[PDB]
């Protein structure tokens with residue numbers, strides 16, 4: 244898991260994290276072809292507390308092995324401390340959707356929702372609660388492949404417009420509150436990267452949700468898919484489906500779209 248710094252060709256900065264800049268780059272793997280990687284850097288990792296907190300983000304990702312969750316490639320524990328992650332070449336999902344808009348067929352938008360449900364069903368199997376499921380934290384590996392981005396790099400692991408009522412009211416975060424967030428993420432995909440409750444103040448969102456109001460059916464969204472979103476948005480968390488159920492229904496919805 245230790246990587247030697249001379250085996251890294253550092254490229255363009257692709258974002259800013261809590262500990263430092265994130266770069267795109269190449270990892271010259273021994274006896275293998277070079278890999279496209281994402282480099283999480285750390286500015287203040289000279290302090291033992293900062294370094295321990297930063298390296299804990301790599302340990303979090305190390306425990307996951309799923310094709311739709313970014314992989315930890317390795318770490319560089321010499322100063323400056325770097326975390327080497329798998330690169331998703333095409334970048335952030337919200338930007339990809341805004342550029343490609345209706346040129347992305349429905350079969351592709353449903354495929355993205357399905358792929359995310361397989362990663363979230365995998366996290367659920369390992370009893371891990373994400374807390375920040377949103378299109379902002381999804382990345383694009385290729386035209387037919389999306390992935391959950393780095394967990395440390397995710398800002399809220401307050402996004403009130405994505406949160407379940409029990410998370411807003413009592414700060415309760417469970418796999419059921421992740422399902423509510425995933426429903427909002429599915430809505431964002433079908434809306435081509437448009438943010439939920441745009442132009443609505445965060446305090447009024449809570450009132451609307453309690454009153455039974457939900458995000459509208461996106462244009463050209465299959466009714467079976469909008470029905471699946473409304474099940475994620477059941478006020479009572481015990482009435483919301485689990486990720487394995489969402490995965491099965493999304494698979495059926497994807498097959499039906501491919502048929503026509």
Ligand SMILES: CN(c1ccccc1/C=N/c1nc(Nc2ccc3c(c2)CC(=O)N3)ncc1C(F)(F)F)S(C)(=O)=O
Pocket residue numbers: 257258259260265267281282283313328329330331332333334335379380381382391392393394396397398
């Ligand atoms: C939103 N994410 C970030 C948040 C804070 C800082 C950086 C990130 C992106 N990280 C990553 N980005 C890519 N590919 C990528 C390629 C080109 C561009 C971009 C992203 C953005 C941009 O403009 N061009 N692949 C892997 C990761 C990593 F493993 F680190 F997560 S997240 C929570 O990790 O998904």
